[PDB]
């Protein structure tokens, strides 16, 4: 029941930034980061129907100007809707690189990417295509290592999903620092994955594909110095009961011939 001038102005600037694909931005939209009420503003603008360059410039604006929790709510709502929108509108499931750039700015802003986009995506169950897409973004662009290893620790605490293991493969190959408490988290993930020869589990017995196998290889490859020796022979038991065909003995050689702290 808001004022009619706000209604008309924001839906008509919504149509303006629908018909936009080239050019510049309004006085209204560049004084929107001079205010606070962005949720109400952009909810009267109705954001989810604009153009790729438009979501590009909105992300450039909010990442360049605003701060953490505003970035959280903005990136969750807007980028999740636009990301799903772009992928399930493209029939071969391709993302527009300007929306990829929006994701890149979301990474670049420090506490914007994990609070807003990636973790509600893990809750809402994206497909493996979107998983590989955000993994390639995480490969090219880099947040602070603290926040990156934070994403690692929380995704290893959160349950298994194929997006979960693809993302954790992307991080373990992204090759940041792995603290010993984080390898506590990661081998806790691994002891919820292995077989408990008394209470078995679905995550402890289910089917675990080959991208997870590459993740196991890069974990025991790079990070053999932080797995403590009980975690070492626990990885021995894990890989021997759930080994592979050509990746597994490489994991075993890396695992035994690794010394640690």
């Amino acid at each position: 029941a808001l004022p009619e001038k706000v209604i008309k102005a924001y839906t008509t600037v919504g149509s303006i930034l629908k018909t936009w694909t080239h050019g510049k931005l309004p006085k209204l939209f560049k004084v929107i980061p001079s205010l606070r009420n962005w949720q109400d503003v952009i909810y009267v603008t109705n954001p989810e129907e604009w153009s790729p360059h438009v979501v590009y410039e909105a992300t450039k604006l909010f990442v360049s100007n605003l701060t953490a929790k505003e970035s959280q709510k903005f990136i969750n709502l807007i980028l999740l809707e636009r990301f799903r929108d772009n992928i399930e509108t493209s029939e071969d499931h391709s993302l527009n690189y300007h929306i990829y750039r929006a994701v890149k700015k979301s990474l670049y802003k420090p506490s914007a990417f994990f609070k807003g986009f990636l973790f509600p995506l893990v809750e809402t169950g994206c497909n493996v295509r979107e998983a590989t897409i955000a993994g390639s973004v995480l490969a090219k662009v880099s947040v602070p290592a603290l926040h990156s290893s934070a994403a690692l620790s929380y995704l290893l605490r959160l349950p298994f999903s194929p997006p979960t293991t693809v993302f954790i493969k992307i991080l373990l190959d992204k090759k940041y620092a792995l603290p010993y408490q984080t390898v506590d988290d990661c081998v806790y993930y691994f002891m919820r994955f292995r077989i408990l020869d008394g209470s078995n589990g679905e995550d402890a017995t289910r089917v675990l594909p080959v991208i997870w196998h590459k993740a196991f290889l890069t974990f025991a490859q790079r990070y053999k110095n932080d797995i403590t020796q009980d975690q070492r022979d626990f990885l021995l038991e894990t890989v021997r009961q759930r080994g592979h065909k050509d990746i597994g003995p490489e994991i075993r050689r890396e695992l035994l011939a690794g010394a640690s702290r």
Binding site: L2, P3, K5, V6, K8, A9, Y10, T12, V13, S15, I16, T19, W20, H22, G23, P26, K27, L28, V31, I32, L35, R36, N37, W38, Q39, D40, V41, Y43, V44, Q72, S111, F114, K115, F119, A145, L146, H147, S149, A150, A151, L152, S153, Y154, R157, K175, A177, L178, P179, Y180, Q181, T182, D185, Q221, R222, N225, D226, R261
Partner: protein, 220 residues
């Protein structure tokens, strides 16, 4: 008629893009001039105001507490690295054939120590330094001091003279294959200094130090 048709098509294209971009320009400017300030003022008259993030903050604190790294890319096969090196040797061969056809501070520190372990003192100084310009300037005054000590004494025997000089010479090798321009201008003006000394007196400035200067440059 086909060519004219294609051109008519392009004309239609340019006309469409110009008119539509003009329309969007008009509308955006209109709203930006009236309804912009309207919306700003009136929405300002209005208003608009955890396991994941908790784990994020906690594991960031964890990261700060305990970062840890050890880089390791994929290992290299025997024949792979060996043939790459053999080919690099071939490239070196080709480059060689194609080329064929077409101080007191250092003194004080080291002599304050002792030569017979100043080999080690210097290697350590270099180790600390290597963990650009530091390296270059020290290498230059190192070669100077090498000349100096070799012209200062020849008392020691094959056991303690040769080993010091040859380990130093290996250091010279590796520092040469890394940095060279400092060495080059050092030895250039070194030729200047020794030719001026010859011109002062022909034989009263030549010695085993300048002879081994010839030797070390000729093997470097």
């Amino acid at each position: 008629k086909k060519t004219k048709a294609e051109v008519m098509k392009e004309v239609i294209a340019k006309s469409k893009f110009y008119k539509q971009e003009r329309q969007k320009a008009q509308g955006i400017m209109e709203d930006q001039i009236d309804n912009l300030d309207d919306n700003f003022e009136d929405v300002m008259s209005e208003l608009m105001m955890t396991d994941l993030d908790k784990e994020y903050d906690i594991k960031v604190k964890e990261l700060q507490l305990d970062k840890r790294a050890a880089p390791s890319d994929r290992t290299k096969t025997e024949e792979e690295k060996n043939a790459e090196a053999e080919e690099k040797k071939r490239e070196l061969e080709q480059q060689r054939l194609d080329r064929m056809n077409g101080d007191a501070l250092l003194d004080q520190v080291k002599k304050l120590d002792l030569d017979d372990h100043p080999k080690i003192v210097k290697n350590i100084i270099k180790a600390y330094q290597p963990k650009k310009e530091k390296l270059g300037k020290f290498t230059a005054v190192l070669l100077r001091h090498i000349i100096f000590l070799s012209n200062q004494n020849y008392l020691k025997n094959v056991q303690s003279f040769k080993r010091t000089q040859n380990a130093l010479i290996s250091i010279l090798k590796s520092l040469s294959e890394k940095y060279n321009r400092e060495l080059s201008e050092e030895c250039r003006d070194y030729i200047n200094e020794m030719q001026a000394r010859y011109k002062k007196n022909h034989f009263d400035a030549l010695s085993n130090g300048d002879l081994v200067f010839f030797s070390i440059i000729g093997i470097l």
